[PDB]
Design a protein around this ligand. Structure first.
Ligand SMILES: C[S@@+](CC[C@H](N)C(=O)[O-])C[C@H]1O[C@@H](n2cnc3c(N)ncnc32)[C@H](O)[C@@H]1O
Ligand SMILES: [K+]
Ligand SMILES: [K+]
Ligand SMILES: [Mg+2]
Ligand SMILES: [Mg+2]
Ligand SMILES: [Mg+2]
Ligand SMILES: [Mg+2]
Ligand SMILES: [Mg+2]
Ligand SMILES: [Mg+2]
Ligand SMILES: [Mg+2]
Ligand SMILES: [Mg+2]
Ligand SMILES: [Mg+2]
Ligand SMILES: [Mg+2]
Ligand SMILES: [Mg+2]
Lengths: 95, 54, 346, 55, 140
RNA sequence: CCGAGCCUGGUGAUAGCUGGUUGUCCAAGAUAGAAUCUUAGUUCAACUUUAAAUUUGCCCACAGAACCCUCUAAAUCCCCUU
RNA sequence: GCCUGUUUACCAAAAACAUCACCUCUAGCAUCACCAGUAUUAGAGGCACCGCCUGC
RNA sequence: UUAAUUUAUUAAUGCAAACAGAAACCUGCAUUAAAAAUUUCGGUUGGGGCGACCUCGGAGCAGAACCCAACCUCCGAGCAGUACAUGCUAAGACUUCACCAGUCAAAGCGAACACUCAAUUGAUCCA
């Protein structure tokens, strides 16, 4: 990671994280399952069912991805007809 | 136009589909039936061998 | 600490070259002028005989093979029994080509019954099954039956009500199950008629004494055909040199155990796919002395000279064998090498 | 490691474009199965068109 | 340039002496008509697999004979064990038959003097060898 | 100080390696592992620290945890009271 | 080891290298080398003078 | 050096170009070599060798919840077969001591009237 750029002197964003992950404004990171398109003929329907699901990264992984991206990706967006719009905020959350 | 052509194509194929299923199901029974006759014929040929022993 | 700066290192030979060198020294003296003729046949691809699956449409397959000019040597040999004058295991149909013909059979195609029409196997490997003289209602025990070159032939006869197929290697056993499943219909294998196990053959000399009338024993040995071509799991590599040294010992032990397993008055055929006389006749003589000295068991080796003359047309036989019969490969008849010896228990 | 079976692709005869992959033995005729088609929500005939690979 | 490539291949790729090249061309005129790839393959077969050095090739008229008959005769002798490929040092276990004996003499004489096999056996080997050659070309 | 001269520059080359790492006082504070061209390292977990929130935590009475298996083992896990 | 000669300046002077002699390889020719030369010449090598030796 | 990656460079041919009327020089694009350039030398174990080993599963050590190591003590696995709703979805849990992966699953929709197997497997990018 480049903490200070050579032409602007500011932190950069790793484009590997952006393409492979989605960040909700609540802080959660949504990713895909590694291997949801690989050798589907030898996998049971139950196994394939959880491979094509979107899962949340844990605390350690989420903290790692917050340092590899700049604040432009942590801002709140208001896209029209956003499939993940309802998941940008937590409800009935304690502690 | 593309949606209607696909819908018409699906409807046209599904029109013949019940007849195709019956023909396919009928052929599967016939193919097994031909093999079953061969199984009986094998016993008949093996019955000839028993005749030779006797 | 290991020393990696040796003054002289033995040059690395391929396992094929290692097998060729050992065979060249031993077999040149044993066979004399016939070794060069044998050697070319070993290096050339062996001819494959088409064994008709009796469970499938055998009559239709026979007609199909006749179109490819295939000739049933088994049927020809049966008519030769009276011409020359225990007989042999009946209900076997194997089609091969003419002497000197290089035509290869097409791959087998499953029939209407869902089973393969025929099995492709060496024609020299069918002789031990024929020499076994199988009869209906008998109980047949096969040691080292996997992958099933001779195991499948026994079921084609239909003379074995109960079969005990045992091979030490489970990987070979797994191949045997698939071959039986693809060829033999499930109804026969449904019951206890075919028993496929994976245990040491030495155990069969104690667990089942006098249980079986006909026992076929094909002990593991240095396969001349496979060693000179295959590069995987070759017995002639340096790591497996220890196994080759103890190989004749296992051949004596496994054969002796099978002899204990058979009932007195039964027939035991010893089969080996090799040309080395130190593993063909000496093993047979080793087992005979082993039984008499340790368990006081006497066996009689039958004469295969009558059997030799019947297949002389389609097979090449070596006429300088003390006890067993050795079928040497030839350019015209590429079947072999095969060594089979028949002994009965008294 | 001889390829005893092969992986083939079955195409629906209803024209819906639905397809699924199945495993079949190499030495066998092309399969003609009766599989469920989610597009029409009923079982429809399928026919083998192209072999994908060897297993 | 067709002549230029042939002699250059002999002098550079085959590394034949200029004196040897003159004797080769006078003795064997079929070299010019032969394709460069087959000519190079024919030469290296004698040098490596057979073990024949440059002076012996020129004197024995190796290049004039067809490639196919060389393959049939050499491999059969090699499989017979009569012919042993020289090792790294150049020594051989059993002295090889003379090269002129293998090639110059007729097929019937070739079997009798060296192979010591029946005529029928050699006929089967050629068909078997051609199948292996046919498979070898397809695999490559 | 020639298995590739010397000098200058790139150059504050790089070194998972060696050495060093400067005032006072108090407090908490040690040994499960996994992956690794990796076992002289690093990452994660375990452990440890501070802050914060909350309510149970530890100890443990019966009951309860397999047969082919009598080394018919010492003893655990679970666990209200306390 | 033919010989005189040469080499590790600063741990090896030698059986090592070179050396006449012999052998192999390459080249048919001008105007800065080879060369102001031309197959009895030039270059690239091996061996180390000289003398002697079979089988086939 | 028959390690990998290249022919820029050099030389020899081919074509295009350019010419005369045929050719050469030059230039571009190729194919052959030549001579070089860049870079690397997987770990584990083994003093008298001519190698074995690296992933996954079961049994003993590890006797009774779980876990628990070798140079350990033993056997294997890199499949096949039957299905063709081996369809679509969804509470609550397990988890090989992390992660990645892996496993079970009520209800519901739709049909019938979570296949066997201890292992039988390969991520991302890319095509
Ligand atoms: C040369 S093969 C013979 C194959 C088979 N009998 C045939 O002819 O088709 C010998 C087989 O014996 C098996 N084998 C080796 N050792 C064995 C043993 N100790 N007990 C039983 N079988 C053994 C090996 O798996 C090997 O595949
Ligand atoms: K390190
Ligand atoms: K000096
Ligand atoms: Mg200096
Ligand atoms: Mg530094
Ligand atoms: Mg303290
Ligand atoms: Mg790696
Ligand atoms: Mg001197
Ligand atoms: Mg003098
Ligand atoms: Mg000095
Ligand atoms: Mg000195
Ligand atoms: Mg010298
Ligand atoms: Mg670079
Ligand atoms: Mg876990």
């Amino acid at each position: 990671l480049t903490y200070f750029s050579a032409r602007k002197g500011k932190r950069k964003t790793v484009k590997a994280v952006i393409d492979r992950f989605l960040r909700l404004h609540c802080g959660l990171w949504v990713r895909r399952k590694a291997g949801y398109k690989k050798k589907l003929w030898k996998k049971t329907p139950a196994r394939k069912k959880r491979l094509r699901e979107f899962v949340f990264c844990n605390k350690t992984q989420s903290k790692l991805l917050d340092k590899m991206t700049t604040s432009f990706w942590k801002r709140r967006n208001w896209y029209v007809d956003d499939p993940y719009q309802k998941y940008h905020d937590r409800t009935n959350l304690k502690v | 136009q593309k949606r209607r052509e696909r819908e018409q194509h699906i409807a046209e194929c599904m029109a013949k589909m019940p007849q195709m299923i019956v023909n396919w199901q009928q052929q599967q029974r016939e193919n097994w039936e031909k093999a079953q006759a061969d199984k009986e014929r094998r016993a008949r040929l093996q019955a000839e061998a028993q005749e030779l022993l006797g | 600490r290991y020393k990696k700066k040796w003054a002289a290192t033995e040059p690395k030979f391929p396992a094929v070259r290692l097998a060729l060198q050992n065979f060249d020294m031993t077999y040149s003296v044993q066979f004399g002028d016939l070794w060069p003729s044998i050697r070319v046949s070993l290096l050339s691809e062996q001819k494959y005989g088409a064994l008709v699956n009796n469970f499938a449409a055998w009559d239709h397959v026979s007609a199909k093979l006749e179109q490819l000019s295939a000739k049933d040597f088994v049927n020809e040999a049966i008519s030769h029994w009276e011409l020359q004058s225990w007989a042999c295991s009946p209900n076997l149909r194997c089609f091969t080509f003419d002497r000197g013909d290089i035509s290869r059979f097409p791959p087998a195609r499953p029939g209407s019954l869902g089973v393969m029409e025929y099995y492709l196997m060496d024609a020299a490997s069918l002789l031990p099954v024929l020499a076994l003289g199988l009869q209906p209602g008998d109980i047949v025990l096969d040691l080292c039956a996997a992958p099933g070159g001779k195991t499948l032939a026994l079921l084609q006869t239909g003379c074995c009500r109960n079969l005990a197929a045992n091979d030490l290697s489970p990987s070979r056993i797994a191949r045997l199950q698939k071959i039986l499943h693809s060829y033999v219909p499930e109804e026969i294998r449904d019951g206890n008629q075919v028993r496929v196990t994976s245990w040491d053959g030495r155990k069969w000399g104690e667990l089942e004494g006098d249980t079986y009338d006909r026992v076929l024993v094909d002990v593991p040995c240095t396969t001349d055909r496979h060693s000179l071509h295959e590069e995987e799991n070759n017995i002639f590599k340096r790591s497996r040199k220890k196994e080759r040294q103890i190989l004749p010992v296992l051949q004596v032990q496994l054969l002796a155990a099978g002899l204990l397993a058979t009932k007195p008055g039964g027939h035991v055929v010893y089969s080996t796919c090799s040309l080395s006389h130190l593993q063909n006749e000496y093993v047979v003589q080793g087992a005979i002395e082993l039984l008499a000295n340790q368990y006081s068991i006497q066996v009689q080796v039958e004469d295969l000279t009558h059997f030799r003359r019947v297949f002389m047309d389609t097979f090449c036989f070596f006429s300088s064998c003390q006890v067993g019969e050795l079928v040497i490969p030839n350019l015209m008849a590429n079947f072999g090498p095969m060594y089979f010896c028949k002994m009965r228990r008294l | 490691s001889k390829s005893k079976n092969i992986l083939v692709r079955m195409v629906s005869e209803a024209g819906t474009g639905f397809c699924f992959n199945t495993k079949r033995n190499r030495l066998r005729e092309k399969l003609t199965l009766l599989h469920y088609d989610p597009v029409v929500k009923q079982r429809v005939l399928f026919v083998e068109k192209k072999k994908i690979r060897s297993l | 340039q067709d002549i230029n490539d042939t002699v250059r291949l002999l002098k550079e790729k085959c590394l034949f002496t200029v004196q040897q090249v003159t004797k080769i061309l006078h003795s064997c005129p079929s070299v010019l008509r032969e394709d460069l790839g087959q000519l190079e393959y024919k030469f290296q077969y004698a040098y490596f697999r057979m073990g024949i050095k440059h002076p012996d090739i020129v004197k024995s008229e190796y290049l004039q004979y067809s490639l196919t008959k060389i393959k049939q005769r050499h491999i059969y002798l090699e499989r017979l064990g009569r012919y042993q490929t020289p090792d790294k040092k150049g020594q051989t276990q059993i002295p090889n038959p003379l090269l002129k004996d293998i090639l110059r003499v007729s097929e019937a004489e070739f079997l009798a003097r060296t192979a010591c096999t029946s005529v029928e056996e050699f006929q089967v080997f050629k068909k078997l060898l051609a199948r292996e050659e046919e498979e070898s070309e397809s695999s490559t």
